[PDB]
Design a protein around this ligand. Sequence first.
Ligand SMILES: CCCCCCCCCCCCCCCCCC(=O)O[C@@H](COC(=O)CCCCCCCCCCCCCCC)COP(=O)(O)OCCN
Lengths: 102, 139, 88, 34
Amino acid sequence: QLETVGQIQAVSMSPDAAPSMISMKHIGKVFEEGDSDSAAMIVLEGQRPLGDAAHAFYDQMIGRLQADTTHVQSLQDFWGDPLTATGAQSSDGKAAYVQVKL
Amino acid sequence: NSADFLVINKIAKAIFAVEGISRVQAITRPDGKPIEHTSIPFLISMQEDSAAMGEAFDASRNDDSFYLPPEVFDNPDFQRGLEQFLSPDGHAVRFIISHEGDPMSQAGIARIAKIKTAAKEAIKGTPLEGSAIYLGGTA
Amino acid sequence: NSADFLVINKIAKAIFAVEGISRVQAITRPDGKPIEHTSIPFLISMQEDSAAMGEAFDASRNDDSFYLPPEVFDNPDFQRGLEQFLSP
Amino acid sequence: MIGTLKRAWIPLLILVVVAIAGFTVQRIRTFFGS
Ligand SMILES: CCCCCCCCCCCCCCCCCC(=O)O[C@@H](COC(=O)CCCCCCCCCCCCCCC)COP(=O)(O)OCCN
């Protein structure tokens, strides 16, 4: 049916000549992290401030995510590093996130 | 190197000073807040009056002045943050910018040219002048 | 006088901060680049590391601070440039 | 001659319209990216 072929042959949203697409491809290439525009944000939110079990689960999660080479191209930890940890955490400490490049 | 981190912090500040920009994140600002122990009461380093000054400049996140010694590029707990923000050969640095309101409004889209202009005027007259400025994102 | 040269450097930087302007040239900046050894670590002065801050603040041509002590107005290497920029 | 260009005024008007439109289109195609 028409929808199957339309889903097979989908085309990008932005042209290759778009300065933002040029910029995103170049940024991803220079930092050795993929040639795409996609990126998801795995937010994890806790009803109480995120503790050490949260960090253990998060470490396991990023381990499982990095291992899949087919779809996950990279991810910026920023929370598994104490120097940048507070850059991936809400002010009240109940939420944290990690960006994954697809 | 310590010389080109002053220009990196200058770019970070010049971007953070754009209107609808909040929470710029750089290597000299690894969590949107400046690195402690880098403001002016620490470039100057009896002490009980020069310690309260450093503590008043650390409690305010004051980052008008800034210095990071060359002793941090071999600090083993700094390389995992140095790899995220600088290219593996150090030739390119990246800043992660957040907006205040809606990124995809009419204003969050008019802020893109302003971010590029701010970053361009920050390196004017510095040894990084003439560098290529790439701005990717969703807005 | 060293008091008014701070306002002069302030005017130089405020003009340099205009968007389409490059290479402002003033007495406190006689070649579009700030004068060396006037930055923030040179009004401060364990020593070999402070000499590293001194060169890091000059290898970036930083100009967030400027003093230029008052005994440079009698330096003969200064008058030929001071006559080009300030009135007689 | 005017007598013969007014039996073929429709194809001539079509040519001039298509030419102006095509030039304007190939001019506007260049603005994006640049
Ligand atoms: C979005 C695109 C729009 C672009 C185009 C805008 C419109 C442009 C209008 C230009 C008018 C040119 C057409 C001239 C028609 C001439 C008529 C003619 O030559 O023959 C008639 C002769 O009748 C006359 O006497 C007309 C003589 C006057 C012609 C003078 C041209 C006037 C130009 C008008 C200027 C308006 C331009 C507006 C531009 C924005 C009768 O011939 P026929 O019955 O045998 O043909 C029919 C069978 N195919």
